[PDB]
From a paper:
The AAA+ (ATPases Associated with various cellular Activities) family member Rea1 (or Midasin) consists of nearly 5000 amino acids and generates force to mechanically remove assembly factors. Rea1 pulls out the Ytm1 complex to promote the transfer of pre-60S particles from the nucleolus to the nucleoplasm.
The Rea1 linker map revealed side-chains throughout. The 210 Å length of the complete linker fits well with the ~200 Å AAA+ ring extension that bends towards the pre-60S particle when Rea1 is bound to it, suggesting that the linker is a key element for Rea1 tail remodelling. Comparing 2D projections of our Rea1 structure to this data suggests the pivot point area is located in the region between middle and stem domains of the linker. The horseshoe-like arrangement of the three linker top domains is stabilised by the middle domain. The top3 domain is a four α-helix bundle insertion into the linker top2 domain, and it connects this domain back to the globular extension of the linker middle domain. The D/E-rich region and the MIDAS domain that follows are not resolved.
Residue numbers in the entry: 2356 to 2381, 2390 to 2764, 2772 to 3156, 3174 to 3182, 3202 to 3274, 3280 to 3417, 3427 to 3557, 3559 to 3560, ...
C-alpha cells in the first residue's frame, strides 16, 4: 500500500495532483491522499527528482527532441533496471538493500506518528474514565490531568523517537550510508511494540524495551555509521527514571536456583487438581490402624508418579488414572466408616520428631517408612524423592501454626514419659499400643547414626556449601582456591557498582563469622547476616522480572514477521502492472524473514496478568518489619539482654507466617520468585532460634541436666555422683512439706550407695542424705502436735516411709553382683520427677549413653504386655487381653442380629454392658472384671432360650463358661496361702520404727544408760508377730556404725549386747506361732476342699462364694490375736533351763618350715644374736604353759544339782520329816561352807539389768561367740532373784555378788586380747609370703597399677552383661546378631587375669611382666570393637569404648626393737610360776587370767610389728640391699611364729575356763532361785 503510490506515477505526478479525484470517489482513497501530502510537505518528492536529472538529460539528447517536463517518466520504485541504475554515479546505494526501505520507512513513520495524534486528541476529551495508560501518560503533557500514574512517563519518551526520525529524514538529502534504512526499520517496529504493551499495565514489560533500544545503539555504532552521533539521548533520560537500586542480581541468581515447572495452560489447572486430592488423602491417612500400612505406602507412591507426569506434559491417561486414586481413597473411606473404636493418635510427638533428624534429600528411604504413621502431609513428601526441592529441607518442617526439639534431649525426655504413663489408659488401647511402641523401636534403631552426629557442626557445613555457591556465580572461578584479596579484585570486574557495597558489608562478614563459630550465638549471628545479605541482592524496588525478557523477544519476532508478510502480499498485486511474470529486482532486494528462527520462547509461561502488583506487595512487607533497621534492633537487644527480648520475636515470626502463606495461595500461576524468596525468610527465622537456644543455656539455676540417670557412664563414676549432690542442695532444703517428690529422689541416692558397694567416697551422700529425711519428719511432727478391706470395714505417706527403710535394710547385705539392667528402671522414674518439678535446667545434645537405656525401657514394657497373682488386687494385662477378645467376638455377633430386631431389651442391655466392659482401664482388680463377665453371661443365657434354633451361639456360651471356671481357680490359690499378705501388712509398720531409733542412736553418736532405757522400751512394749521385724532392723543400725569405723566404738558396744540379749528369746516366740498356725491351717484346708464343682452350673458358683467369704474373715481375725498378743509376758517369765562347740583355733607348724643360709647372709647384726639357743629355749618354755590346767567350776555345781535332785524328787509330800529336815540343812550347810573356803562398790555396778548392760565390754570378735552362751543366761533370772529374796538366803545372795564382779572385769582385758590377736594373725601371713619373695619390693611402683586393675574388676564384667542385653533387643528388629560372640570371648579371657592379681596378698616384682600383658589386652580389645562397629549399630559399642578411654640399716633396727620387746615380754610370763584344787582357787584363777594377759603386753608387741611392716610396704628398694632385708625378716620370723603360738595357748585356756565358770554360775543360781520360791 505505499507501492500503490509508487506504481501510479504518470508524468508529471499523475496529472499534477489533479484536485482530489479520490475525494470525488468518497477510507483507502482518503488515507492514500494523506501519504502524498506527507510526501510533498517533506522534500522526499523533491530529492528523488534531483536524481533523475542526469537521466532526463541523457534521454533528451539520445532520443528525439521534445518539450521538457518537470519530472521524468519513471516510477517511485527507482531500483528495477533500465539505466536508472546508472543514475548511481553519486549515492551508490540503489544496488544496496537500503533502496527499498527509503519508501517503506515513510509508510511506517506515518502510521505511528499519526497514531500519537489520535491519543493526544483523546486526552482532551475526558479524564480518568475508562482511559488507557498511554493516554493517561499524556495528562502531564496536556491540560486535563489525573491523580496518579506518572512513574514511567511513556508518552513523553515514546515521542522523541519519532521526531528525530522526522528531523533526520527531512534534512538529510543523502540516500547513502552503511545500512541506515536497514537500521531505521527495526526501531520503527519496537515503537509499534512499545505502543501495544503500554495500553493498560505491565511496567515490568518495559525492562526489555530499555534493552532493545540499547542493543540497537550498540548495533548502529558497530556499523561505523555517523547517524548515532546525531541524537545520542533517546534513552539517557529513560534509564534515569526507570532504573532500580535495591537488587541488581535478580537476573543472574534466578537462573541457577530455578527448578522445573510446567509450561502449558492445560497443566496448572491439572496441577491444582492433584494438590486438591493430596489434601483429602491426609484426612484419611490419620484414621487407619496398623494393618493398613501396605496400601497407604502404595498410594504415597502414585502421587510421585503423577508429579513426574504433570511435569512431563503428557496428559492422555492423566484424567483416567486420577479417577483410580479417587476410587482408591473412597474404598479406604468405606472401611473408615465401620470403626467402632476410634484411633487415638498416640506417640504423636515421637514420630513427628524423628523426621527432623532425618528430613533431607539424602536418606529419603528412612523418611518414607516414617511417613504414613506421622503427621507429615503428602504434598511435602514428594519434594524428597524427586529433587524438585530448593533450600535445605529442615525449614519446611520446623515452623507450624520446634527448633528446640532438634538441638536438645526433648525427644528422649518425652519417650520415657509416654512409656511410664502407658498403663493408666483404657482397655481399647492395649492392642493398638503394642503395635505403636513396636514401630517406634524399629525407627530409633534404623535412625541411630542420624541421632548421634553433631548438630551444631552440621548446619555450619550446609551454610558453607550454600554461601560458597553465591560467591561462585558472582565472582568468576571457585571460591575455595582463592585468597582474601583475589576475590575483592574480581568484584568490580564482574558485578555492578551497587552490589559491591553489600557484597563487602554483609556476605564477607557472614563468611568470617561462619568459620570462627564456636557456640550457637556465633553461628546464629553468622546466619542472620547472610539472611539480610541476599535480600539486598534479590528483591528490586521497581518491578523487574527475568522471565519477561524471553517472552518479548518472541513477540517482537512475531510482529516483524507480520510486517514482512504484509509487505510481500501488498506488493504482489503490483507484479501484474508494470512487470512481466518472472522476477523483479526488488524481490531480491527485500529481506525475507525466516521461519526457523524461533528464539526459544518457552521457559516458564506467564500470561497477560501483570506482575507489577506482586512487587508492590514485597516492598510493602520488607520495608515494614523486615528492613535492615528493624532486624539490627533485635540483634542489638539480644546482645545487651536488657529487657523485653522474647516478645518482639513472636510478633516477627507471626508476621512472616501469614506473609509466606499469602504468597503460597496467592496468584496461583508462578512460584519461581516465591520459592527463592521463601528460602530467605525461613533462613532468617532460623537465625533467631539459634539465639533462643543460647540464652536458655545461659540461664542455669541448676547445672544438672535431666537424663542424669539412664546412662551407664555418669552413674559409675564415684566422683560424679558426689558432685551431683552438692548442686541439688537448693532443691532438698528449699522444699515444701507434703510434696512426696523430694523423698523419692533420696530413695535413689540410697540405691547408689548400695550400687557402688558402700565406698568411702560416697559416705557423705549417705549420712547427709538421711539427715534431710529426718528433718522432713521433725517438721511434720511439729505441725501434727500443734473382700480384704471390704469385710474388714464392716467390723501415700506410709508407702514412702515403708520404702525409706526397706532400702535401708537391703543396703546392708553381703553381696549384690551389681548390674545395670535393674538399676536403670529405677532411674526411669526419677526423670519424670526431675523434668516436671525442677525447672531452669541445662540443655544438652543426645549421647550414646542415654540411647542404650531408653530402648531398654520400651522393650521392658512391650514384653510385659505380651508374656505372662493376687486375686482382687492384680491388674493382669495378659489375662485382660484374653477377656478383651472373647467379648469382642460376642459384640460382633450382636451387630449382625440387631438391624432387623432393634427394639428388644436383651439385645440393648448386653450391648450397653459389653461397651462398658471394654472401657475398663488396666489398673482394675479381677474382682470387678469377674463381675462384668458374670452379668453378660446371664443376658446371653436368657436370650438363647427365648430365641429360635437359628442363633448358633453354642460356640460363644461354651467359651465364656470355661473362662469363668478358669478365673475361679486363681481365686482358690489366694485362699490357699492367705497368710503371706497378713505377714506383710504387719511388716508395713517398719516405716514408723526407723525414725524412732534414729533419734536415740545416731544423734547421740552425732549416754550409755540413756540409750538402753530408750531401747528396752522398743522390745518390751511390742507384739509377737512384729518381733522378728524389730530384730531385723536394729541389726541394720549395728552395721551402720561398723560402716563408720572407729570413731565411736562405745555406741557399737551398747547395741551389740542388746541384740544378743533379745535374740535369746526368739526360739520361744517362734514356737508360739508355728504351733498355733497348725490349728488354723487345717481349718482353711477343709473349706477349700468343699468348694469344688461337678456339672459346673455357673449360677451356683456365685452363691458358694459369699458363704465362703463369711467364714474366712473370722480365721483371719483369730490369726490377728496371735500376732498382736503382748510380748512382755515371755520376757518377764524367763527361760526354761543341756550345755557347746568352739572355733578351735590351732595352727602352729604351718610356717616353721631358706633359713639356714639366711643367718650367714646377714651389716649391723654384730653391733648388738644367736638363734640356736633362742628358738630352742622359746619352744622349751612353750610346753610349760600348755601343761598348766585349771580345774572347772561347772563340775562342782553339777555335783550339787544331782544331790538336790535325789533329796527333793523322792519326797512323797504326805504329812520321816525329822530325818529329812536334817539332810536338807546338810547340803545347805555344806554348800555355803565350801564356797566360803574357795575364794569369794560391787552393788554400785549391778543395780539392775539396764545398768550392767551399759558398762560392759563386748565380744565382737568371731572366735568366741560361744563364750556368751551362758552369761546372757544369768541375766534373765537376775531380776527374778531380787524379787523373791531365813539367814542362808541373805548369805547366798551376797555370795553371788562377788562372783559376778569377778566375772564382769574379765571381759575387758580378754576382748582387748583378741583385738590384738587378729591384727598379728593378718601380719603373720604378710611376712610369711614375704620370705618366699623372689623379685624385689615394687610397692611404690606397682600399688598404683593394682587400683587400675581392681577398678576394672567390679565394673567391666558388668558392662559386658549390659551390652549383651541391648544387642538382643536389636536382634529382634535387625540381622546384626553375630556381634555377641566377640563380647563373651572378651569376658572369659578376663577371668584368667583377675585371678592372678588376687592370688597374691603381698605383691611381687613378676607382676610388672604380667601387668604389661593386661595393658596389651586392652589395646587389643579396643581394636576388636572398632572392627565390629560396622554393618550394624554403633551406640551399643560407643559407651564401652568411651569408658575405657576415660579410665585407661634402719630396717634392721625396727626388727631389733621388736626382738628385744618379744623376749622381755616373754621373760616376765615365766617369772610367775605355773603351779598346775587344794584351797582358795577362785580368788587365784580369776587373778591368774588377769596376770598372764597383762604380762604378754600384746598392745605393745603388736605395735612394734605395725611400725616394722610399714617400712617394708610403703617404701621401695632396688635389687641392691634387698637380699639383706630378706635375710633379716627370715631371722626374726621363727620367733614371731612362736609368740603367735604363745597366744594360741593362753587364749584357748582362758576361753574354756570362762565357759565353765559361767556355766557353773548358771547351775548354782537356779538352786538358790528354787530355794527362795519353795
Amino acid at each position: 500500500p505505499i507501492e500503490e503510490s509508487l506504481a501510479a506515477v504518470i508524468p508529471i505526478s499523475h496529472l499534477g495532483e489533479v484536485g482530489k479525484w479520490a475525494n470525488n470517489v468518497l477510507k483507502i482513497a482518503e488515507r492514500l491522499y494523506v501519504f502524498i501530502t506527507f510526501l510533498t510537505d517533506m522534500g522526499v518528492l523533491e530529492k528523488i527528482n534531483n536524481l533523475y536529472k542526469p537521466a532526463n538529460l541523457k534521454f533528451q539528447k539520445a532520443l528525439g527532441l521534445h518539450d521538457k517536463q518537470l519530472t521524468e517518466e519513471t516510477v517511485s520504485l527507482t531500483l528495477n533496471e533500465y539505466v536508472l541504475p546508472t543514475v548511481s554515479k553519486y549515492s551508490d546505494k540503489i544496488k544496496s538493500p537500503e533502496s527499498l526501505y527509503l519508501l517503506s520507512s515513510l509508510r511506517l513513520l506515518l502510521n505511528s506518528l499519526n497514531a500519537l495524534k489520535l491519543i493526544n486528541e483523546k486526552s482532551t476529551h475526558g479524564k480518568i474514565d475508562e482511559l488507557t495508560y498511554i493516554e493517561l501518560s499524556a495528562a502531564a503533557f496536556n491540560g486535563r490531568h489525573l491523580k496518579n500514574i506518572p512513574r514511567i512517563p511513556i508518552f513523553c519518551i515514546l515521542y522523541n523517537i519519532l521526531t528525530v526520525m522526522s528531523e533526520n529524514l527531512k534534512t538529510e538529502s543523502l540516500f547513502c550510508g552503511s545500512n541506515q534504512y536497514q537500521y531505521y526499520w527495526d526501531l520503527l517496529v519496537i515503537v509499534i511494540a512499545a505502543l501495544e504493551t503500554a495500553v493498560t499495565k505491565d511496567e515490568a514489560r518495559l525492562r526489555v524495551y530499555k534493552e532493545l533500544i540499547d542493543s540497537w545503539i550498540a548495533s548502529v555504532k558497530s556499523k561505523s555509521d555517523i547517524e548515532i552521533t546525531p541524537f545520542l539521548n533517546i534513552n539517557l533520560e529513560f534509564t534515569d527514571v526507570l532504573q532500580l537500586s535495591r537488587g541488581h542480581s535478580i537476573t543472574l541468581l534466578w537462573d541457577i536456583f530455578r527448578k522445573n515447572y510446567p509450561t502449558t495452560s492445560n497443566s496448572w489447572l491439572a496441577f491444582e487438581k492433584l494438590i486438591n486430592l493430596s489434601e483429602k488423602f491426609d484426612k484419611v491417612r490419620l484414621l487407619q490402624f496398623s494393618e493398613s500400612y501396605n496400601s497407604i505406602k502404595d498410594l504415597m507412591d502414585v502421587f510421585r508418579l503423577l508429579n513426574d507426569d504433570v511435569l512431563n506434559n503428557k496428559l492422555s491417561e492423566f484424567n483416567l488414572l486420577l479417577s483410580k486414586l479417587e476410587d482408591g481413597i473412597n474404598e479406604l473411606e468405606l472401611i473408615s466408616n465401620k470403626f467402632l473404636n476410634k484411633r487415638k493418635h498416640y506417640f504423636a510427638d515421637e514420630f513427628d520428631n524423628l523426621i527432623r533428624y532425618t528430613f533431607s534429600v539424602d536418606t529419603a528411604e528412612l523418611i518414607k517408612e516414617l511417613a504414613p504413621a506421622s503427621s507429615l502431609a503428602t504434598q511435602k513428601l514428594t519434594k524428597l524423592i524427586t529433587n524438585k526441592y530448593n533450600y535445605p529441607p529442615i525449614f519446611d518442617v520446623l515452623w507450624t501454626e520446634f527448633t528446640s526439639t532438634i538441638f536438645s534431649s526433648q525427644f528422649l525426655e518425652d519417650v520415657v514419659r509416654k512409656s511410664n504413663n502407658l498403663k493408666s489408659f483404657s482397655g481399647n488401647q492395649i492392642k493398638q499400643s503394642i503395635s505403636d511402641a513396636e514401630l517406634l523401636l524399629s525407627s530409633t534403631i534404623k535412625c541411630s547414626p542420624n541421632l548421634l552426629k553433631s548438630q551444631m557442626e552440621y548446619y555450619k557445613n550446609m551454610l558453607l556449601s550454600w554461601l560458597r555457591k553465591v560467591i561462585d556465580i558472582h565472582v568468576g572461578g571457585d571460591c575455595l582456591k582463592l585468597t582474601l584479596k583475589e576475590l575483592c579484585s574480581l568484584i568490580e570486574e564482574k558485578t555492578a557498582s551497587e552490589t559491591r557495597v553489600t557484597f563487602a558489608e554483609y556476605i564477607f562478614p557472614a563468611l568470617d563469622l561462619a568459620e570462627s563459630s564456636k557456640s550457637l550465638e556465633e553461628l546464629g549471628e553468622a546466619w542472620i547476616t547472610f539472611g539480610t545479605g541476599l535480600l539486598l541482592l534479590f528483591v528490586p524496588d521497581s518491578p523487574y522480572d527475568p522471565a519477561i525478557h524471553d517472552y518479548v523477544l518472541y513477540d517482537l519476532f512475531l510482529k516483524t514477521k507480520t510486517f514482512s508478510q504484509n509487505l510481500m502480499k501488498s506488493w504482489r498485486n503490483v507484479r501484474k502492472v508494470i512487470s512481466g511474470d518472472e522476477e523483479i529486482f526488488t524481490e531480491k532486494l527485500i529481506n525475507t524473514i525466516s521461519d526457523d528462527d524461533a528464539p526459544q520462547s518457552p521457559r516458564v509461561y506467564r500470561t497477560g496478568m501483570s506482575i507489577d502488583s506482586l512487587f508492590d506487595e514485597w516492598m510493602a512487607f520488607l520495608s515494614s518489619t523486615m528492613s535492615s533497621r528493624q532486624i539490627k534492633e533485635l540483634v542489638s537487644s539480644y546482645k545487651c539482654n536488657s529487657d523485653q527480648s522474647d516478645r518482639r520475636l513472636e510478633m516477627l515470626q507471626q508476621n512472616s507466617a501469614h506473609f509466606l502463606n499469602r504468597l503460597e495461595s496467592g496468584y496461583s500461576k508462578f512460584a519461581d520468585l516465591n520459592d527463592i524468596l521463601a528460602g530467605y525468610i525461613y533462613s532468617i527465622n532460623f537465625g533467631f532460634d539459634l539465639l533462643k537456644l543460647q540464652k536458655s543455656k545461659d540461664r542455669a539455676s541448676f547445672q544438672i541436666s535431666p537424663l542424669w540417670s539412664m546412662d551407664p557412664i555418669n552413674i559409675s563414676c564415684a566422683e560424679n555422683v558426689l558432685s551431683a549432690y552438692h548442686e541439688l542442695s537448693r532443691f532438698f532444703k528449699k522444699g515444701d512439706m507434703e510434696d512426696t517428690s523430694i523423698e523419692k529422689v533420696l530413695m535413689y541416692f540410697l540405691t547408689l550407695f548400695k550400687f557402688h558397694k558402700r565406698d568411702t567416697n560416697l559416705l557423705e551422700i549417705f549420712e547427709a542424705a538421711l539427715y534431710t529425711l529426718y528433718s522432713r519428719w521433725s517438721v511434720r511432727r511439729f505441725r501434727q502436735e500443734q473382700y480384704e478391706a471390704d469385710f474388714r470395714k464392716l467390723f501415700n505417706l506410709d508407702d514412702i516411709y515403708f520404702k525409706l527403710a526397706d532400702t535401708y535394710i537391703s543396703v546392708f547385705d553381703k553381696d549384690h553382683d551389681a548390674n545395670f539392667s535393674s538399676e536403670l528402671k529405677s532411674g526411669a522414674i526419677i526423670t519424670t520427677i526431675l523434668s516436671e518439678d525442677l525447672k531452669n535446667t541445662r540443655i544438652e545434645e543426645l549421647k550414646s549413653g542415654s540411647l542404650s537405656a531408653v530402648i531398654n525401657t520400651l522393650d521392658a514394657e512391650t514384653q510385659s504386655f505380651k508374656n505372662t497373682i493376687d486375686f482382687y488386687h492384680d491388674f493382669s494385662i495378659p489375662e485382660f487381653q484374653k477377656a478383651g477378645d472373647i467379648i469382642e467376638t460376642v459384640l460382633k455377633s450382636v451387630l449382625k442380629l440387631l438391624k432387623q430386631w432393634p427394639e428388644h431389651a436383651t439385645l440393648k442391655e448386653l450391648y450397653r454392658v459389653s461397651q462398658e466392659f471394654l472401657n475398663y482401664p488396666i489398673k482394675t482388680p479381677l474382682a470387678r472384671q469377674l463381675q462384668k463377665i458374670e452379668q453378660i453371661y446371664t443376658y446371653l443365657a436368657e436370650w438363647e432360650k427365648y430365641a429360635s434354633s437359628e442363633v448358633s451361639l453354642n460356640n460363644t456360651v461354651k467359651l465364656i463358661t470355661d473362662l469363668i471356671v478358669s478365673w475361679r481357680k486363681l481365686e482358690l490359690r489366694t485362699w490357699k496361702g492367705l497368710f503371706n499378705s497378713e505377714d506383710a501388712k504387719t511388716r508395713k509398720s517398719i516405716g514408723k520404727w526407723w525414725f524412732y531409733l534414729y533419734e536415740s542412736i545416731v544423734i547421740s553418736n552425732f549416754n550409755a544408760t540413756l540409750l538402753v532405757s530408750s531401747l528396752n522400751l522398743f522390745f518390751s512394749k511390742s507384739t509377737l508377730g512384729e518381733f522378728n521385724a524389730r530384730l531385723d532392723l536394729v541389726k541394720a543400725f549395728y552395721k551402720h556404725i561398723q560402716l563408720i569405723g572407729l570413731r565411736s566404738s562405745k555406741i557399737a558396744g551398747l547395741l551389740h549386747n542388746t541384740i544378743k540379749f533379745y535374740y535369746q528369746f526368739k526360739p520361744l516366740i517362734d514356737e508360739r506361732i508355728t504351733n498355733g498356725k497348725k490349728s488354723l491351717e487345717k481349718e482353711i484346708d477343709d473349706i477349700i476342699l468343699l468348694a469344688s464343682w461337678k456339672d459346673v452350673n455357673v449360677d451356683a458358683l456365685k452363691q458358694s462364694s459369699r458363704k465362703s467369704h463369711n467364714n474366712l474373715y473370722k480365721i483371719v481375725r483369730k490369726y490377728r490375736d496371735l500376732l498382736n498378743g503382748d510380748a512382755k509376758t515371755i520376757i518377764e517369765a524367763g527361760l526354761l533351763y543341756x550345755x557347746x562347740x568352739x572355733x578351735x583355733x590351732x595352727x602352729x607348724x604351718x610356717x616353721x618350715x631358706x633359713x639356714x643360709x639366711x643367718x650367714x647372709x646377714x651389716x649391723x647384726x654384730x653391733x648388738x644374736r644367736n638363734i640356736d639357743t633362742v628358738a630352742s629355749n622359746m619352744d622349751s618354755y612353750l610346753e610349760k604353759i600348755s601343761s598348766q590346767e585349771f580345774p572347772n567350776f561347772a563340775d562342782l555345781a553339777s555335783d550339787f544339782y544331782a544331790e538336790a535332785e535325789r533329796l527333793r524328787k523322792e519326797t512323797p509330800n504326805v504329812y520321816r520329816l525329822a530325818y529329812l529336815k536334817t539332810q536338807k540343812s546338810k547340803l545347805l550347810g555344806d554348800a555355803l561352807k565350801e564356797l566360803r573356803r574357795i575364794g569369794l562398790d560391787i552393788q554400785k555396778v549391778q543395780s539392775s539389768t539396764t545398768t550392767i548392760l551399759a558398762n560392759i565390754a563386748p565380744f565382737n570378735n568371731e572366735y568366741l561367740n560361744s563364750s556368751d552362751a551362758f552369761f546372757f543366761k544369768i541375766l534373765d533370772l537376775l531380776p527374778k532373784l531380787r524379787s523373791a529374796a531365813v539367814a542362808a538366803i541373805e548369805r547366798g545372795m551376797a555370795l553371788a555378788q562377788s562372783l559376778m564382779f569377778s566375772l564382769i572385769t574379765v571381759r575387758h582385758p580378754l576382748s582387748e586380747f583378741t583385738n590384738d590377736y587378729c591384727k598379728i594373725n593378718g601380719m603373720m601371713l604378710d611376712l610369711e609370703h614375704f620370705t618366699c619373695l623372689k623379685g624385689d619390693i615394687v610397692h611404690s611402683s606397682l600399688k598404683a597399677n593394682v587400683d587400675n586393675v581392681r577398678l576394672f574388676e567390679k565394673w567391666l564384667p558388668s558392662l559386658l552383661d549390659y551390652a549383651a542385653q541391648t544387642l538382643s533387643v536389636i536382634s529382634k528388629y535387625s540381622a546384626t546378631s553375630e556381634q555377641q560372640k566377640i563380647l563373651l570371648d572378651a569376658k572369659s579371657t578376663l577371668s584368667s587375669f583377675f585371678v592372678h592379681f588376687n592370688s597374691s596378698r603381698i605383691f611381687d616384682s613378676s607382676f610388672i611382666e604380667s601387668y604389661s600383658r593386661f595393658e596389651l589386652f586392652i589395646n587389643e580389645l579396643l581394636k576388636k570393637l572398632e572392627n565390629a562397629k560396622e554393618t550394624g549399630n554403633a551406640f551399643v559399642f560407643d559407651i564401652i569404648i568411651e569408658w575405657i578411654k576415660a579410665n585407661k640399716e634402719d630396717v634392721e633396727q625396727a626388727f631389733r626393737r621388736t626382738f628385744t620387746s618379744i623376749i622381755l615380754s616373754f621373760q616376765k610370763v615365766i617369772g610367775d610360776g605355773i603351779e598346775s584344787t587344794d584351797d582358795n582357787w577362785l580368788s587365784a584363777s580369776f587373778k591368774k587370767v588377769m596376770v598372764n594377759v597383762k604380762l604378754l603386753r600384746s598392745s605393745v608387741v603388736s605395735k612394734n610389728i605395725e611400725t616394722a611392716l610399714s617400712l617394708l610396704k610403703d617404701f621401695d628398694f632396688t635389687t641392691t640391699e634387698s637380699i639383706y632385708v630378706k635375710s633379716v625378716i627370715s631371722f626374726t620370723l621363727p620367733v614371731i611364729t612362736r609368740y603367735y603360738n604363745a597366744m594360741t595357748v593362753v587364749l584357748e585356756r582362758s576361753r574354756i575356763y570362762y565357759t565353765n565358770t559361767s556355766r557353773g554360775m548358771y547351775i548354782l543360781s537356779t538352786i538358790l532361785h528354787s530355794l527362795a520360791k519353795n
